[PDB]
Design a protein around this ligand. Sequence first.
Ligand SMILES: *[C@@H]1O[C@H](CO)[C@@H](O[C@@H]2O[C@H](CO)[C@@H](O[C@@H]3O[C@H](CO)[C@@H](O)[C@H](O)[C@@H]3O)[C@H](O)[C@H]2NC(C)=O)[C@H](O)[C@H]1NC(C)=O
Lengths: 197, 215, 214
Amino acid sequence: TNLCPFGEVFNATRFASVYAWNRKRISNCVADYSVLYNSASFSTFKCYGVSPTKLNDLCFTNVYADSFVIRGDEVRQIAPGQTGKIADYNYKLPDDFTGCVIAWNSNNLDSKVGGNYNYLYRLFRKSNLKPFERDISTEIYQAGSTPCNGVEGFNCYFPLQSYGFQPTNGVGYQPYRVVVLSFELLHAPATVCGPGS
Amino acid sequence: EVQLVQSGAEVKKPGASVKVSCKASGYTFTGYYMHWVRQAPGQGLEWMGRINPNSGGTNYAQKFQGRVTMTRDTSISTAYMELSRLRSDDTAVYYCARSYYDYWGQGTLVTVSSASTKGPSVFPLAPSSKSTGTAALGCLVKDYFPEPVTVSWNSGALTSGVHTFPAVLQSSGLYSLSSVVTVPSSSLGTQTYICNVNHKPSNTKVDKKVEPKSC
Amino acid sequence: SVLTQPPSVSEAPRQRVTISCSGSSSNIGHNAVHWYQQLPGKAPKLLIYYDDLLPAGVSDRFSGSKSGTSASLAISGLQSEDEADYYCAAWDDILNGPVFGGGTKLTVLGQPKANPTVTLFPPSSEELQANKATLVCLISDFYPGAVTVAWKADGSPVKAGVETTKPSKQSNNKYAASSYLSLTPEQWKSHRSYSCQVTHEGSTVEKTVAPTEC
Ligand SMILES: *[C@@H]1O[C@H](CO)[C@@H](O[C@@H]2O[C@H](CO)[C@@H](O[C@@H]3O[C@H](CO)[C@@H](O)[C@H](O)[C@@H]3O)[C@H](O)[C@H]2NC(C)=O)[C@H](O)[C@H]1NC(C)=O
């Protein structure tokens, strides 16, 4: 009876910025996915490569829980084959993704009267992200011929920008917490299984 | 919060020099370019030059090459702009601005004039070719220094249709303005129109009667 | 000036206006466009950077785009607080520095449009006796408060000696502006006619004076 520390991920008091998205490896434990999948708390719960109802009977070598906060209208970007600043520069899912994307509105936690500017995202990158790649660099983005040499100015832009989370905003601009579960089946003993495995 | 606070308004004679300061707060002074942008009264913005506050490298607009010096004192997070051999047409509000002008100072007025305290002389702007339906008349308040002047009509009895314009700074280094009134043309042969001009920087106070003219 | 903007635009509250910024290959063609808002009597402020990005705290009613060597700023849900001069700027590779547009005055229509009345005063007899000659062109009762003033002596455009005030609000809330042509008496008597030409909302009105007539 080792249950998986999902509450540590789903109920964590603070979430990471999407550009520095948190990853937690889940290993050597019993996981009840039924409770998550059947919870009305999650407005988004779309799986790729797996049936959610079948999870309670499967075993996996490992499970990863990636978490971050984005804007409501950016949740659509957390899916295979999407484009946009979030999919391109912050968090990319492979075309062969095997896992589930979970999201719920966090306006009551991540909004502050006057704007919460603690959650950041990457707006500039010379290059798209590879699937599951993380880029936490803060080098000035050189958009021109001239080098920036660590000073911001014309064509020399800081690569991260802050979200403005105000409780007044429309739903599309409110913060959403997102948890992406990936299911890995490697040539090794499976350590994560559902209760009815 | 990022703040850029500039030194106060300057009055300089042609040929002299002006040094304007810009104190930065709320960020790492050496991490962002500083620019100087000027704006002649009522005109557009004009870029003068830039300084890298880390390296101290400068780059100037062609038309100010040889006349401007931009410097920085990192120990007090201050940038400076010194403009030499001033000309009348250097009268302007001068701004410092950070990076891609993402934050601006509040601006420093520099007025370049060779002039001392002087009261205006007042000339009449007569109406013409209107018998009996509206006619414009006024007064030209010419060559005074410094600003400002006050103008009333008939010791304040006439306010309807009255407008007093802002001043212009002439090439002379002296200010001029006009005040006009619109009146019925059929009132000209009867009603008397006097502009009362008071210059409080000097102590000149002039009353000029504006009467119709004989062509 | 290096970038060309419309001098003037206007639209009703709650509607959408657009402001164009026109450049060349050396600036807009290769570099990012930026937009600045200057409220009356205040310093400029950044509105848009890198063509379409918004600084933190800038309302999403403002948006920008670039196509080729041209750029535009779009303001939706027009509010009366948006009345300001708007400037674009971009880096220019040939001049090795950032260049400005001439600026665009935005009016949010809160009253009926009104044509200027114009009066061109010749130099006064008193002023001539002081050995001076100032032609005084007064412009009043127009809305929106945006005009272009042009002087012609006989058939040539007059640029030197001209000073013009930015439109100022009248007591009736229409706008007025003034223009001066400062001459010597000899210049004044050497031409046959002088004219002050006032362009407002695409219409140009003209008044003329002549040294021998009134
Ligand atoms: C994240 O935290 C919340 C709150 O601490 C967890 O939800 C709560 O879980 C408890 C125990 O599972 C629930 O108590 C039960 O409530 C039901 C209501 O019908 C009742 O029938 C049971 O007898 C029991 O008292 C509690 O209601 C529930 N709260 C909410 C708001 O759902 C949640 O499980 C945590 N998430 C994870 C992944 O651990």
